[PDB]
Symmetry: D2
Subunit: 124 residues, 4 copies
Amino acid sequence: GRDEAGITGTWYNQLGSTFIVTAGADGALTGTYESAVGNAESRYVLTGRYDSAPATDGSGTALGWTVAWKNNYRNAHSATTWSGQYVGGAEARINTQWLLTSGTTEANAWASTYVGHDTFTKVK
Amino acid sequence: GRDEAGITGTWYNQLGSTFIVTAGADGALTGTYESAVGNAESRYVLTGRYDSAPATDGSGTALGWTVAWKNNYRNAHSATTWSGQYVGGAEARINTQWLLTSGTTEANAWASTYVGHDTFTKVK
Amino acid sequence: GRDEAGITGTWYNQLGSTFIVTAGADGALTGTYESAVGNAESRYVLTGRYDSAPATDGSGTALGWTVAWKNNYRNAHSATTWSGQYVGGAEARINTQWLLTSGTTEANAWASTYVGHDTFTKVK
Amino acid sequence: GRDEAGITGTWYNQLGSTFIVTAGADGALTGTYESAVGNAESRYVLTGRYDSAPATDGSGTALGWTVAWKNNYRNAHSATTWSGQYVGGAEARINTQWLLTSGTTEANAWASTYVGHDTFTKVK
Ligand SMILES: [C-]#N
Ligand SMILES: [C-]#N
């Protein structure tokens, strides 16, 4: 995977959350997520995918992953998906936008989904 | 998993795309996706997560998954994440919103990401 | 405005909300919105814009509008923007996606914004 | 309007775009937008709304506005809506997320809408 090495490891977003990921040669992303905010404690499983053969023209690397907010400690009856791109070089970034959907009744379905943006760095 | 049985199987969206998924007792989603539209052909790997112990109050089941649009045939240098909820009963649905991010240059990053909504049914 | 006539009037979404709009020759949208759901009662002012000279190739007509959820009855300390396109012909539609932002503290800013989709018709 | 004074004036986002707005005592936003990127040149009309009586608890002020990307120079057959909140004090900000919809054919409607985020400051 072209950015397998670049992506694999520990990442931190602007909220102080921690994303620990392994990138597989096959396009797999596996790891754990720890949210500094919301109805969350400790680590949650994540899985996702990335483009293991990106464009050679200085474009970033498309990727995404999911966390369901259930672990042994808590269940927030919700899942977040991050969609974004990895940008390599001296100050590597993963720039994402995310959708957080809660399980709701049909009456409340219109308010099921939050949208936001997280920027992940290798430091802080 | 409460909706493991409900979720596992073949789903169809309003665009004529096909989503084939296995739900694991542990919250895993694994399978393949075939898009009726865009820079896509044949099946792509998907992975994701779902709430294996949802609320008992008639709420839906939160879930999400990712496809990176690389397979043996094509590479669209992009990934989609679907975030939504499974709603059980006679006419079972998965109601999603999705983010599609393309790898871009930093100049074009502002236009990296599409947002849309897909509704999945067990028929048609 | 090419679709001035097409757009002007009363529209209904899938939630039973009512959107009453005048399209101006200059691209203006003005009117009122009444939400069937959420922290809302009676009519709220809306303003927005539309493409008064759309493509002639069967493309829809881009448009958007805002409601701030303050009127004489209530203040939900929030605003929704609908972004979408008007599609003309026998069963005219306005197909939208929307962002609802609440005023929050900086601590809660990550959860400030909902995303959804509304489809508006001239009947029901 | 509590933040009428705070909001009215010239704002700059991270892309180098310029947003010139007047906030009305009644919740109105009117002005012009000049995009540093995309199929845009010179100024475009904007209109929108803001919460003229926000919470007193340190919450931001909800607001939104629309630009249709037609002016005397160009027509990009598209509209953007920004949804966000104004945050007052020494380093005032407008933190937004936006939807950009293009007029499309029904075949291409699934790819009609971009999502992004802009942060506006009074300097740079
Ligand atoms: C690409 N439009
Ligand atoms: C507010 N939940």
